[PDB]
DNA sequence: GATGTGCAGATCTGCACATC
DNA sequence: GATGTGCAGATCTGCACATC
């Protein structure tokens with residue numbers, strides 16, 4: 393199947409509100425074995441988030457102003473380049489406080505991750521993180537920093553631009569719109585043929601159409617894609 | 618200082634496209650370039666947003682230079698910022714490429730900086746700053762990572778907010794193709810189209826597959842999508 | 851209800867050929 | 871070239887039923 397960066401690039405192109413996007417982001421994170429994801433926009437010390445991290449951890453994170461303690465945000469602020477982090481692996485040279493921070497985050501299964509930080513308008517920044525409950529992130533192939541940046545640039549803009557087709561309906565329909573067969577969609581998305589078949593036939597039924605070409609035309613005409 | 622930063626700031630302003638294109642043109646000028654060019658590529662089907670001379674835009678597509686331009690070739694091959702130069706590449710270039718670059722020079726396009734990225738559904742987009750200088754003499758190399766981050770945002774601003782192409786490759790449908798394709802777009806089968814338009818099933822079959830051949834698409838859904846996207850229906 | 855499984859028959863797509 | 875013929879195999883659509 394395609395990489396999650398490609399999945400994110402595809403998602404950045406679908407229509408819909410924040411709710412639709414979050415459903416899609418969570419599914420991608422889950423699909424690739426991550427416990428959650430988090431998008432953060434940071435201007436100075438002011439942060440806004442689009443994440444599926446436990447609400448309890450989010451509240452604590454905001455309440456105790458962890459943006460100023462989180463080693464991940466520190467690195468992101470320091471260098472705009474994708475990186476992997478690990479609470480366990482980073483232990484040495486981590487203040488007693490940064491240590492307490494990681495132990496608390498561990499209670500939520502946030503122990504390691506991959507983060508992609510980029511510069512955005514007005515000298516501010518945005519970062520996207522894929523979190524794991526594993527001790528460390530082990531990768532056979534290093535992720536292309538350039539491709540990672542291009543992907544997050546699109547994801548950031550899409551979020552900044554914030555009935556509808558759901559993420560799977562939209563994502564699958566978009567591939568139908570570029571000539572893919574359902575088997576090919578199953579392969580690139582890493583899902584079962586039947587999941588693609590079921591999702592799309594339901595879309596067809598809800599819109600009362602008899603062919604993919606009709607669903608495609610109606611979706612485009614109605615700005616659903 | 619740093620046009621990449623200016624582009625990032627511009628990618629954030631939401632308003633009508635007329636202001637976006639003006640902003641892009643202004644940045645290109647401010648930093649000493651002859652102009653800019655954004656291309657969204659979907660296998661030979663290309664849409665452009667650029668302030669390159671209107672005549673060059675017309676020639677570029679009428680001659681299908683996308684298939685000749687070494688800049689596009691390199692972009693399709695590797696998604697990484699690069700600088701190009703007609704004069705510097707001379708030795709490497711064939712007779713058609715040299716000529717190609719010659720015509721471009723007539724429009725103030727002799728060298729440039731191009732940033733290509735991958736976009737949704739296996740396609741790509743690229744942003745170029747063109748100069749009239751024989752070569753780009755950069756004092757400091759432009760960070761490929763930062764460049765990608767910027768163009769990812771510019772691509773989303775142009776594409777997601779549905780900007781009007783300033784130029785694109787020629788794609789059309791003759792009267793019959795259009796008539797039959799409109800029916801396909803509302804759920805009809807080839808047979809049903811034959812009955813309603815009072816023609817042979819083979820007439821509909823051949824008219825549409827030839828159109829599919831011309832657009833280079835594998836399915837009717839794809840032909841339908843490109844046709845609607847291009848306003849042919 | 852949300853999804854998934856199966857498949858018969860409907861349709862289309864890819865290829866080789868033929869005719870206007 | 872534009873249009874038309876022929877068809878095996880690819881691919882989809884509609885309906886019935888299964889899972890949990």
Ligand SMILES: CCCCCC(=O)CC(=O)N[C@H]1CCOC1=O
Pocket residue numbers: 430431432441443445449450453462464465493494497502505521523
């Ligand atoms: C609003 C919720 C906080 C999101 C924080 C973020 O983006 C970066 C990050 O994953 N930091 C990790 C590392 C240890 O705990 C975390 O949460």
Ligand SMILES: CCCCCC(=O)CC(=O)N[C@H]1CCOC1=O
Pocket residue numbers: 654655656665667669673674677678686688689717718721726729745747784
């Ligand atoms: C529609 C106008 C064509 C834009 C093509 C483009 O984006 C890349 C590019 O700069 N190619 C250059 C190099 C020689 O001529 C050009 O135009």
